[PDB]
Design a binder for this molecule. Structure first.
Ligand SMILES: *[C@@H]1O[C@H](CO)[C@@H](O[C@@H]2O[C@H](CO)[C@@H](O[C@@H]3O[C@H](CO[C@H]4O[C@H](CO[C@H]5O[C@H](CO)[C@@H](O)[C@H](O)[C@@H]5O)[C@@H](O)[C@H](O[C@H]5O[C@H](CO)[C@@H](O)[C@H](O)[C@@H]5O[C@H]5O[C@H](CO)[C@@H](O)[C@H](O)[C@@H]5O)[C@@H]4O)[C@@H](O)[C@H](O[C@H]4O[C@H](CO)[C@@H](O)[C@H](O)[C@@H]4O[C@H]4O[C@H](CO)[C@@H](O)[C@H](O)[C@@H]4O)[C@@H]3O)[C@H](O)[C@H]2NC(C)=O)[C@H](O)[C@H]1NC(C)=O
Ligand SMILES: NS(=O)(=O)C1CCN(C(=O)C2CC3=C(C2)CN(C(=O)c2cc(OCC4CCOCC4)nc(C4CC4)c2)C3)CC1
Ligand SMILES: NS(=O)(=O)C1CCN(C(=O)C2CC3=C(C2)CN(C(=O)c2cc(OCC4CCOCC4)nc(C4CC4)c2)C3)CC1
Ligand SMILES: [Ca+2]
Ligand SMILES: [Ca+2]
Ligand SMILES: [Cl-]
Ligand SMILES: [K+]
Ligand code: NA
Ligand SMILES: [Zn+2]
Length: 805
């Protein structure tokens, strides 16, 4: 829209509030709206004499034409060149100073809290920290002397706006709404693009980003965004000038963004020899900032975060898959292409368009096919990439180093580029960086890798703000912090369990399936009773029972080898917990326990499954949560065939589940010196990442009230010190978990005609999960009763086992 650009920026340069149409603008974003006053360049973007003081300029008379100053008044004016005190007052560059612990904020009088400066680097791959260390001394000083992770995991897709906005909000893209760098919203009937004006409309941007959270709570925020044409040196000088403002106008939070190294990375690849110079240049910018802070006596006052959005992979246009090689109908689709694919109908008036036929035509068609198609609800749940109408139903997960495109003309265009990003967020090349330096961060401390969704909470903790509701786990990053830790309380248990005893006779049941229990001494008779009353429960429930965080009716069921929380509403366990020692033996299913299920005399027939429904349902079979293969004794093996341990399983999924239970659990116990396993169903028919209520379930076992899970989870816990057995661990724990999709075929696994040893593990790795993912999906809270700090437990709950080298 039109602006009066006739007015002036005099005494307004980089003003901290964005003035409306009646005026022309002088803020750091004015150029991006073509709204600056005519004299913005002249007054606000000075360049004369460059960015550095020289000996000749020391004690110059102030000339207001200069980009920066070397006059005696510059310190109190806050506009010296960042090297002024080095060149003119015999001081050292910050990077040449030994690091010294910052135990408290050393701030000028009138500072109410340490400022936070967020320095974001686009496309800064995690491995640049080591690989570029010789050319980035300032960054290396921040890293070594402050708090750093070896890498930080971005969100999917590993694109720029989704990640930058996740850093801003603590939200998954599905929640904040920036699901891609390009998007179509069918409700608005509008398109969002990198180029163009639509991206500036507020309706795209969900959640509450840090600058708003700060403003709403009375903390002044620096104008976060810089028009691209403003040179980095000017952005630095501007932040330092703002930090020199009076107490009642000075921001408490600042942001710097660099388009490098992403710009060069796309052209040259992540490690192209051309990459050295951009890394040197970013390091020089960091050194300007630190030297400038040091001049202002703020270098032991501010907290600095050095963070990236995502990494960068080698991708060249010869590694392109074309949908025109697969689809005969290729002109009837719209593709959002590149390092991910999203497909929809070109016209909503095409009644032929059929997603099922599209998926089929894209599935395992070429031997080394470098993408895989998914309906979005079938994507790995760790990606949290489905619950937004801007995400098309059909998704293509693209292999690292490749692109997908609709037709070969479209690519001639990725042949002028050698790098890209966007792939699955567990891919090593997509990982990025985190360093925190300052009074509130720890000193010379390495922390484990963590996800970028956690940072918003921490930025809030650094500024004294209450975060808006978000997808971080607040407290899981307390180990990065010297002070201002957030100490939450465990959620309160909402439903208390029943503990049913023996209440039903065998003949009350009509299961249609019933084992012929033929076997029939008081040493063992009291033993069986004590096991049913929970005498072995300390062995199998190592960390307390899970708490149920919603209103329901459920029963705790005790057994020799396993304990369960059985839902009377869903007719199956919510959780089954058991411990397998390193010594445990695997056994096979005896004939008196084949093709049959036993009534559980603690649970009414009306609250039990039955076998007739499985017989009648020609598509659905059943498996067991506690694995009968791992029963401790032949007497205990009967418990594994109780109807209360049965769950609905498609025969295709049974292949996966049996291999897990019969092969992998024991392998893990051998490798990890025992494991504790908690397994159960998940119902997420509306693909929102949250536990379904009973009225959301779309599929039941034929002719019954038995709901069919969308997924099966397992949480596998052992001692981080693997010289201690899982059931006698004195210290921190180790965990890996999965959320496997409960699918009626193995179309996902292109090698599934082979033996399970050639494909099931690969599937499970792709569907690796955090405990916290499982908690959202089940309304359960785990690790209630450990010896450990609750924040250490929150860290453990956010861990993801990625399987990357
Ligand atoms: C990740 O973390 C996030 C954040 O915690 C989790 O996301 C939250 O999840 C909740 C459950 O799905 C969801 O609760 C909704 O809220 C509905 C109100 O939503 C609107 O207002 C929200 C609050 O706005 C105000 O406050 C904030 C505070 O900071 C300010 O910044 C605001 O400016 C306001 O002052 C607002 O956040 C929300 O934003 C969404 O929608 C926008 C479009 O308007 C998008 O721009 C934005 O990106 C958000 O979009 C996401 O979320 C929506 C779902 O809301 C989703 O569809 C999108 O795909 C996208 O994912 C809205 O503007 C409320 O109406 C809902 O109530 C129904 O269900 C409840 C259950 O208790 C019923 O009891 C209730 O009766 C009600 O039923 C009625 O309506 C039904 C639905 O239409 C209808 O069918 C029925 O018959 C009834 O009539 C429910 O409470 C939060 O909205 C959501 N927040 C965000 C930001 O996403 C997320 O779950 C976490 N993920 C995981 C995996 O853990
Ligand atoms: N990869 S690619 O897309 O092929 C490539 C294309 C070319 N390209 C550009 O044109 C850049 C993209 C971009 C520019 C210019 C300026 N810019 C911001 O000023 C910004 C900062 C921010 O910072 C958010 C901060 C929140 C706190 O944590 C640190 C980040 N957030 C947001 C928007 C999300 C709101 C925006 C983002 C680079 C990327
Ligand atoms: N230059 S750029 O980086 O492409 C540009 C992106 C858009 N942008 C925004 O402020 C949006 C608008 C809005 C946000 C983020 C949060 N809410 C309302 C300015 C920076
Ligand atoms: Ca980026
Ligand atoms: Ca759900
Ligand atoms: Cl995209
Ligand atoms: K069946
Ligand atoms: Na297959
Ligand atoms: Zn990029």
């Amino acid at each position: 829209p039109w602006t009066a650009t006739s007015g002036s920026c005099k005494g307004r340069c980089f003003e901290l509030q964005e003035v409306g149409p009646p005026d022309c603008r002088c803020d750091n974003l004015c150029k991006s709206y073509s709204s600056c006053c005519h004299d913005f360049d002249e007054l606000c973007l000075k360049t004369a004499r460059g960015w550095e003081c020289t000996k000749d300029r020391c004690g110059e008379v102030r000339n207001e034409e200069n980009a920066c100053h070397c006059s005696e008044d510059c310190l109190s004016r806050g506009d010296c060149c960042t090297n002024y005190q080095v060149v003119c007052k015999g001081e050292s560059h910050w990077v040449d100073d030994d690091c010294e612990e910052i135990k408290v904020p050393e701030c000028p009088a009138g500072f109410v809290r340490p400022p936070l400066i967020i320095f974001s680097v686009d496309g800064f791959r995690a491995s640049y920290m080591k690989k570029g260390s010789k050319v980035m001394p300032n960054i290396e000083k921040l890293r070594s002397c402050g708090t750093h992770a070896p890498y930080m995991r971005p969100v999917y897709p590993t694109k720029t706006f989704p990640n930058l906005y996740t850093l801003a909000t603590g939200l998954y893209p599905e929640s904040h709404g920036i699901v891609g760098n390009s998007m179509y919203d069918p409700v608005f009937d509008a398109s969002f693009h990198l180029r163009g004006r639509e991206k500036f409309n507020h309706r795209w941007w969900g959640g509450q980003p840090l600058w708003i959270t700060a403003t709403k709570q009375g903390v002044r925020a620096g104008t976060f965004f810089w028009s691209v044409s403003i040179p980095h040196e000017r952005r630095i000088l501007t932040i330092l000038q703002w930090l020199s403002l009076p107490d009642n106008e000075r921001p408490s939070v600042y942001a710097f963004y660099s388009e490098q190294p992403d710009f060069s990375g796309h052209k040259y690849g992540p490690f192209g020899p051309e990459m050295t110079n951009p890394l040197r240049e970013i390091d020089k910018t960091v050194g300007q900032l630190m030297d400038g802070l040091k001049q202002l006596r703020l270098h032991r006052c501010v907290n600095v975060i050095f963070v990236g959005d995502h990494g960068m992979e080698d991708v060249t246009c010869d590694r392109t898959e074309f949908l025109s090689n697969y689809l005969t109908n290729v002109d009837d689709i719209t593709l959002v292409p590149g390092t991910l694919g999203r497909i929809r109908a070109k016209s909503i008036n095409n009644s032929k368009y059929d997603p099922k036929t599209i998926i089929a035509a894209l599935t395992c068609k070429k031997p080394d096919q470098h993408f895989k198609p998914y309906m979005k609800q079938h994507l790995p749940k760790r990606l949290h990439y489905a619950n937004n109408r801007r995400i098309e139903d059909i998704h293509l997960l693209v292999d690292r180093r490749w692109h997908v495109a609709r037709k070969p003309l479209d690519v001639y265009g990725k042949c002028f580029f050698q790098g890209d990003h966007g792939f699955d967020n567990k891919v090593n090349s997509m990982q990025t960086v985190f360093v925190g330096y300052g009074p509130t961060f720890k000193y010379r401390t390495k922390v484990p890798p963590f996800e970028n969704i956690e940072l918003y909470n921490v930025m809030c903790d650094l500024l004294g703000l209450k975060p808006a509701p978000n997808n971080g786990t607040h407290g899981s990053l307390n180990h990065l912090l010297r002070t201002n830790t957030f100490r939450p309380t465990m959620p309160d248990e909402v439903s208390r369990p029943n503990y049913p005893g023996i209440m039903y006779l065998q003949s009350e049941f009509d299961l249609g399936c019933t084992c012929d229990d033929k076997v029939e001494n008081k040493l063992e008779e009291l033993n069986k009773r004590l096991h049913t009353k929970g005498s072995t429960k300390e062995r199998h429930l190592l960390y307390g029972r899970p708490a149920v965080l919603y209103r329901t009716s459920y029963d705790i069921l005790y057994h020799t080898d396993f304990e369960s929380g059985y839902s009377e509403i869903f007719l199956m366990p919510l959780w089954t917990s058991y411990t397998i020692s390193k010594q445990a033996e695997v056994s096979s299913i005896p004939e008196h326990l084949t093709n049959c299920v036993r009534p559980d005399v603690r649970v009414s027939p009306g609250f039990s499954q039955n076998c007739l429904a499985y017989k009648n349902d020609k598509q659905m079979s059943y498996g067991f949560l506690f694995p009968p293969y791992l029963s401790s004794s032949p007497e205990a093996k009967y418990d594994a065939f109780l109807v209360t341990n049965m769950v609905p399983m498609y025969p295709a999924f049974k292949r996966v589940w049996a291999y897990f239970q019969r092969v992998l659990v024991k392998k893990y116990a051998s490798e990890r010196n025992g494991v504790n396993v908690i397994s159960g169903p998940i119902f997420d028919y509306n693909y929102d990442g949250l536990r379904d209520t009973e009225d959301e379930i779309k599929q039941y076992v034929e002719g019954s009230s038995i709901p069919v899970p969308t997924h099966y989870y397992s949480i596998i816990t052992s001692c981080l010190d693997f010289t201690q057995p899982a059931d006698k661990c004195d210290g921190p724990l180790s965990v890996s978990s999965f959320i496997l999709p409960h699918r009626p075929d193995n179309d996902e696994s292109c090698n599934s005609s082979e033996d399970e040893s050639k494909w099931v593990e690969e599937l499970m790795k792709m569907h690796t999960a955090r405990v916290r993912d499982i908690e959202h999906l089940t309304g359960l809270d785990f690790y209630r009763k450990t010896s450990r700090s609750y924040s250490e437990i929150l860290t453990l709950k956010t861990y993801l086992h990625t399987y990357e080298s």
